[PDB]
Amino acid sequence: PGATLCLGHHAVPNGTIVKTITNDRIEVTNATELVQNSSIGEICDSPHQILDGENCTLIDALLGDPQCDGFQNKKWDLFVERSKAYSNCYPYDVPDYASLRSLVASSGTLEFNNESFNWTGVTQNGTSSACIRRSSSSFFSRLNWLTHLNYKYPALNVTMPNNEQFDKLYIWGVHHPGTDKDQIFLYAQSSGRITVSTKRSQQAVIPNIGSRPKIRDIPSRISIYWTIVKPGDILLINSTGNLIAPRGYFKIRSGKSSIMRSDAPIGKCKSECITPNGSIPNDKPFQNVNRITYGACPRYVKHSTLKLATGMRNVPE
């Protein structure tokens, strides 16, 4: 009689289809998904420090739009800009807006230190009904609108040395009046000039007079510029009119901070990886949720599914 001894392997009733080099569809006993395809729909507020911009863009929080006063001196790992955000101060633009937004976002801080420039011969603290703060005509909190004093605007030539151990970021602007008459009412002379310089950089701007479409009844515009002053360097401001003066400097840092456009709510949870859709788990190596990511994130791919076999070929009876 003797015996029979048979060698074999297991099989399962519920196999999984995977792709190989030679076969588009082959069934194995088990597999695991390598593409994360869902988020939880909220941005977890740990471990990264999240600052919800609410109604404010980062640039409006920087300049000091009155609805953004709560953001003064705040810090973030990720600033979240909402699509509902709107400006509600004096109409402005920023040449190379995207770069100023980027450099502030990457710095991660709106810490601001006031400085005494000692503006002599001019009127400080100009305001506008386009920029209401506490039911009163106001202006960007970090900017100083200088105008004539006694129908004189004597030329300004002001120095501010950087005697610190860190870089200073100065934000300033030029006022473009709507008409030649407005130019006189404000600056008591027809042609303003601005020259802002350091030992290693110079920026000279000329106001451009003319009508722009009225925003909160203002046909004028301010154009925003910035200047970085290194330790041992000097800020030199030289102007005969139309200067929107800085009130101090921002600390500029280097680190891991950034900015993201998202409408996802903030949640009390922990997740390393943030997308505009919400946080996603980061166990898998790939994801198809969003090419925009922040943190320890799977890599974005154009595949909805990639199944890795974790078992042998499934061969049922």
Place this chain on the structure above:
Amino acid sequence: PGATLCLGHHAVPNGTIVKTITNDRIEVTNATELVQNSSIGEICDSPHQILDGENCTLIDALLGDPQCDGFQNKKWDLFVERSKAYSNCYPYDVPDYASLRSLVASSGTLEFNNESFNWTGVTQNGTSSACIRRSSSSFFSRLNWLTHLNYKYPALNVTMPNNEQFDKLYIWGVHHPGTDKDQIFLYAQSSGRITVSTKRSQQAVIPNIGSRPKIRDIPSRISIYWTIVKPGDILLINSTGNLIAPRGYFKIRSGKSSIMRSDAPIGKCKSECITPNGSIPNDKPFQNVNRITYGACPRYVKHSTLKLATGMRNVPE
């Protein structure tokens, strides 16, 4: 006696050499080339809609150089710019020419809608012998050269609202006269100003007077600018002289259109993939014809040949 039974495999008299991980040269029974190395030398006019620019650049067709009048309101998937193209109108330049070319190419259309700006107080429709249309002095078809009327150039302050459901693209310019005398002959005053704005953008230009090398006897130049106006926004043009006015707007679209520089002839044939050399077949995954491609194309690589074995090792007797 018994029998012999031998197991074996085929071989061929004309094997093919391929590369592997361990061998630079090994012979297999058959292989297939994965790098497309030839084109048919003509651009097939199907399935993509081809517009042959002939003597015209896209920018000249946009502005309305007289030799380009046949291109008015045309559309394309691929605009083909020829190396023989030349300008034959008033001498101009475009700050950021490459971006205007790109954005029009990607839009895929020169559809243009006239608008009535109601220029009051000035002379319209200025012409030049550098821009001959039908044997007569003319000008860019889509541009309107305004000059003084009765030796007055009263300041312009004109609005054009966008009450459509689509974006409008406005093309306009500034005239730079060759001399201070020409400035007077044309605009009856010494210093022109242009301010073109919307609610969300402003562009202010100052003419720069001086001699440039004469082209078709013209030492003056026009500089071309553009402005996009969103639905619900307004175009505001404010100028005291030197304005080259728009006559209307271009529809700006989004889609799959582009532009390519090529001297290859257009053929009546079908091919998904276009290169400047001509259309190429797209069965193979790679190609070394050209890094410039349009359509469903093999990927460009720096290999002249990559043979994929499609058979076993060839072992002749």
Place this chain on the structure above:
Amino acid sequence: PGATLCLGHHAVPNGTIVKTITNDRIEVTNATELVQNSSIGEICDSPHQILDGENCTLIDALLGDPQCDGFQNKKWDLFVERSKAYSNCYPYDVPDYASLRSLVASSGTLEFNNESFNWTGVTQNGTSSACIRRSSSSFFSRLNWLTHLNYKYPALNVTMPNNEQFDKLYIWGVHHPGTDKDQIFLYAQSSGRITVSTKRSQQAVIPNIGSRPKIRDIPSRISIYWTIVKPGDILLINSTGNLIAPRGYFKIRSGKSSIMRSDAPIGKCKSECITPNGSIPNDKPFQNVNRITYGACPRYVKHSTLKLATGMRNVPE
């Protein structure tokens, strides 16, 4: 009795750990490192032609800062810029400095040909105590500071045709005086204008008067511009003051030249691959020394070690 015949393989006492697809640590008989992790700490002066900038940036050697006179008409495959470099001439800036540096570096030559512009009506060869050459007040060697003659600055309108078979690179500038008074002392009139043009390009600059922080007692600044003139084209310079004139042109070439920032000493040795750390051997396919490389170099990777097995699994007794 019979015999025993055993099949086997070798082993070594000093195996090496490598990584595989299925095992992070498996011992093989031998392996070879694929990541170059060291340099010799000096830049070998063969086979690439190295030019050590010493105290000079490439831009200062271009303009002709007096400490850079030894660099006139030199050529290089790789220009090496040292961190100790400093400027010691009239204070200047270059709009798009990075692009001028790049295009000169890539051209590989400071060959310069003088041209006779025949400046009539003005004083040539203005100098400054900020730019000492041979213990005397001087100026950039390749630049020509024109000022008034007999308190007249008659408008300049000068042509220089390119009748050569190669492209000419012109370097020129605009002087920004510190005060309106300095503007008069130098140019005998209040408002300078510069227009530099060819058939295919135009550059118009306006001086910006005002105080910048003093460098070697100079509160004025020069701004550097460049113009490329093709064969058959013309340089047209049109100016009423503030022109820093060219003295000729630079040959501009195309080829393999570049620039690198490094403090590594130059050595008498041979190496194909240069990094700022020094030359590295290029036998291995990868390296983690520096992402900045020049020549036939291993590819930079973020791995400190990648060991390729060159032997079987090591299985000791």
Place this chain on the structure above:
Amino acid sequence: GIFGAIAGFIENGWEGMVDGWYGFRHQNSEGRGQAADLKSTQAAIDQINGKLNRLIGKTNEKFHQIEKEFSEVEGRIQDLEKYVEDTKIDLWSYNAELLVALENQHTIDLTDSEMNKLFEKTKKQLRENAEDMGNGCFKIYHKCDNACIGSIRNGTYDHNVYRDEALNNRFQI
């Protein structure tokens, strides 16, 4: 698979084997039974866990990057930002799809390999006492009770104990 055991000379897998990936079924004078082989099961699992250790929980941190969505037409610089991102995504998408196809091919081959190795080891243990029936089964030419089967599964079978009996039965007539 490249060894030809799984989905090959083994006709099918055993849904009833739930405590291992590879194993033995026998029929002898005492009945019929099943036992998992722990070492071959563990060898296959360990290799697959090596792949998973390379792939799961190993993401890279990135912080401030470039913008990837744009509200306004801009031309040249925006074209380049979009092309850089599209280029990156296509290269990673290629890497991901190739990785999974290569790894899956290899996982099917290494699990086929472990089945073949167990078969070969058993075949060699039996020496002249059994014959390969061609379907993963051995015909054993001697009485082989449960302890005997267990000695084969455990690697302690002494073929010399049964050789005389087995040769007599094998080389009959």
Place this chain on the structure above:
Amino acid sequence: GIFGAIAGFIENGWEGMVDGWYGFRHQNSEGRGQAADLKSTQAAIDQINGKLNRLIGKTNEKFHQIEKEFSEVEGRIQDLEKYVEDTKIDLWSYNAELLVALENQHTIDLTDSEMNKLFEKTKKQLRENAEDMGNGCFKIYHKCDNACIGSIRNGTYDHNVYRDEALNNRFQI
């Protein structure tokens, strides 16, 4: 190849086999002949066609991109546009060359594998009735006419019919 059959213990291939990739040559009392094995041929062809399905006719559509040729020197932005394109091309060129080398190595191994699988299957069918001569040939120790050879090629050979005859011839003297 990794199994050692093709270009290995099989001395060479058969140019005269034109209706299949693998097959049988025999010599018996009735003559000598050749027959292709359809199943092993199809297994190899199917796997190679799987590779070709991945590679042929699968291109991606791209439309407006960046410029890649330039008529004028520009500096920084043009340097970046050129570097982006050169970077992309080098990475795809690496992918293409590695893909073909890897796939070709695998194609040579899988075709060697199919030859080995057919050899092993035949060897197991013959049980004690034949011996492996070491060169891909079996010496069959019984009269084996054309129908007998055909029963081996078809997988219906009944080794018990011939075993007594074959053992007598094998274990002579």
Place this chain on the structure above:
Amino acid sequence: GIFGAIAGFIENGWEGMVDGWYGFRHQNSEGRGQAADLKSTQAAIDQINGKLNRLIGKTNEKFHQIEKEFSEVEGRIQDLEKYVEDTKIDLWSYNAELLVALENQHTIDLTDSEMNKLFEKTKKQLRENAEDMGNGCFKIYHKCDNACIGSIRNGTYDHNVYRDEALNNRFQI
């Protein structure tokens, strides 16, 4: 390894084999000895040298590129230059690590393969004169002096010379 010889049915390697990678140890009436097999050693070395020819001394020349370090904050264009470089480095770092892991897996398998091929070839040479003891050793059932062992190592062993002697010893009792 995927064949199960090295670190498999061969218990360990031989530190005392210094003139080859694979070889033979014997015990017979004249003593015991060792000899390297040159052909299998060379086959493994040649394949590994093929890999090294692909990898060593094959770098690409690059000249003027983009800047990769920056002394001043600039925003958009610098963000893009940094992202382009970081993207490139991450893709090459992935290529390098995957290449080495894949190649190493393959090198371990191809060296296991060559060990298995030599074993199989020897096994087939011996025909009915020897039995596989399961550990890489053959029990040879006839007197086999040094010249006899050498004829096996050289591939000239004539199994018919010893078959009668060996069958008598094998199929004893």
